[PDB]
Subunit: 357 residues, 2 copies
């Protein structure tokens, strides 16, 4: 019941197919760097914005009116999941996200909802997705998303961001069983949520393991990787059983250089990269099968439009014209210039075509 | 004029020689995890502690009374250099280091001292070094240290820590010339400071590029690597001209997985590693010449003493018995248990001997 997709370059690249140019989108393309985003967000408090389908739809569409991006990503927040699990969150503008009552001991898991009921608590996200898919009218694909189990665990235990994740890693080392219990609750809530996002209209899904870097290989393979593999396996299985077509799935492990090899075998069509991994080395690590996404340093956007063009040209030369979706190595920062974001988008389109003809 | 060194295992490993066991030390071994450190530090404000030779000497010796560490590192702070350069710093316990008036525009470089006069401003550090070298009475080598140019630049421009280094990276992209000017001022101040540390008694030097990870390969090679190479070249040159023996130099680029290959050719005897780089991959990157230092996840110390022993055994199996100095992948955290630090030290000694016999 949705408009037929007109530009599917993003999906074709995600599946590994040859395309006429490299598709490009930007993490946080709906963000504070756009004045219109700030104005729309000023209408209510953060989570009240996430709960209004029209407001999410509007924020999602704003970057598309400025730039010819090849995908839209639904406006929402990864913290909606721990909130639907029963945790109270606050988004204080100066600080960032906060859980005044973080999980600290094993007994604290008792206050969480059964993960099976989370998707019903997240109906507002499904509404925003259906609405935006209708309003996009098939212009480009709509990407749905959620935080990965370990990363969500970090927010729940730390109560917000952290430079070391010492409290959450302390849980991995001192409370391994409780840790697995929590990661499994998170996985069991994420699967039906992600499946519901596709049922509502999402055409691709991205799992954000933004806090992967704090773990080295060993802890990552024990506590992050199994759940990352499970999410993809179970989402595809449920979509099949429901009669729907699976969608391409992207795993983004920020600062996860050490896990690229396992990630390329984790059941995701696309492996997203941060800007610290040289494209050619990433290609060696992942192989010739998966599609890579990324990975320009977001701060490169502070350089002139002309320099941005050169940096993009070099990035595309390293990735090559196959199995690649362009994006930054992390989300856009609040003080970046919309014109520089436009320069980024245009350079990818221009240089990827030159690189094929 | 100093006591002859009794245990030189650390220096022999640093130079790449075979030793009977693997020497081990810990970044922040003089730190808040020790109750005696907190008590000694409570006597005065942070920088007043750094300025008292006896207080620095005492803090340096405290961990050695608890554990048979193979090296001592002088108690000081990397921020003493920008302070001697003319910047006002404050060490507020709740927050951390702070420069209320950070460098933000190019003209702000005019308030800094000529780097040639910095070493005279840092005479108190030379005094603490001479004093501790005397009091150690040759028990183990004394390591001197400083922050690397890029990392010091980050504190000067950001005014403290940051999860993105967006202001400092904005300087790299928008003010490249001013950036090089500042990095060169920092290099020109670090060289005579590090040379003075050895003249005062330091037997090894470690340069802490703690904020390397925010840069990817390209920016790192343009702005961090040249100055890192220059520091080692010029320090060795000045020591030679002065009639002194150069000392082994360690370059520690935290989150610098992408630069290991260049770092191994940067003129340092030892390349320190964070815990995210698997030891075997680090060995492939650096080659068979340089000594590696590291790299246990500091949070591993939250595990039981018995688990710490196994994790250490595995770490040593990966590094192998040659060209290796054991250490954590970053400094000890304030809430770690001194007994677990002892367990770490003992496991390295025990397992490295088993691995040779």
């Amino acid at each position: 019941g949705f408009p037929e997709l007109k530009n599917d370059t993003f999906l074709r690249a995600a599946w590994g197919e040859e395309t006429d140019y490299t598709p490009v989108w930007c993490m946080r393309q709906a963000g504070r760097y756009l004045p219109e985003f700030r104005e729309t967000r000023a209408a209510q408090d953060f989570f009240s914005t996430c709960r209004s389908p029209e407001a999410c739809c509007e924020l999602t569409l704003q970057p598309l009116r400025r730039f010819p991006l090849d995908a839209a990503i639904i406006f929402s927040d990864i913290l909606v999941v721990p909130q639907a699990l029963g945790m109270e969150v606050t988004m204080v503008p100066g600080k960032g996200p906060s859980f005044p009552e973080p999980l600290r001991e094993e007994q604290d898991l008792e206050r969480l909802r059964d993960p099976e009921v989370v998707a019903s608590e997240l109906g507002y996200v499904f509404q925003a997705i259906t609405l935006t898919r209708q309003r996009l009218a098939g212009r480009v694909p709509l990407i749905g998303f959620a935080g990965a189990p370990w990363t969500l665990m970090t927010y729940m235990v730390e109560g917000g961001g952290s430079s070391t994740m010492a409290q959450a890693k302390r849980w991995l080392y001192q409370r391994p069983q409780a840790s697995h219990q929590l990661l499994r609750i998170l996985t069991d809530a994420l699967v039906p949520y992600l499946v519901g996002q596709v049922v509502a209209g999402a055409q691709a899904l991205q799992l954000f393991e933004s806090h992967a870097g704090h773990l080295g290989p060993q802890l990552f393979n024990k506590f992050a990787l199994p759940y990352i593999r499970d999410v993809a396996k179970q989402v595809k299985a449920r979509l099949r059983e429901a009669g729907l077509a699976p969608v391409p799935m992207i795993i983004f492990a920020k600062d996860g250089h050490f896990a690229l090899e396992e990630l390329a075998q984790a059941g995701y069509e696309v492996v997203g990269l941060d800007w610290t991994v040289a494209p050619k080395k990433a290609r060696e690590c992942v192989g010739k099968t998966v599609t890579l996404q990324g990975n320009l340093d977001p701060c490169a956007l502070y350089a002139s439009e002309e320099e941005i063009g050169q940096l993009v040209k070099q990035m595309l030369d390293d990735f090559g014209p196959h199995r690649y979706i362009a994006n930054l190595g992390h989300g856009l920062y609040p003080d970046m210039d919309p014109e520089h974001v436009g320069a980024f988008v245009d350079a990818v389109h221009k240089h990827s075509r030159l690189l094929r003809q």
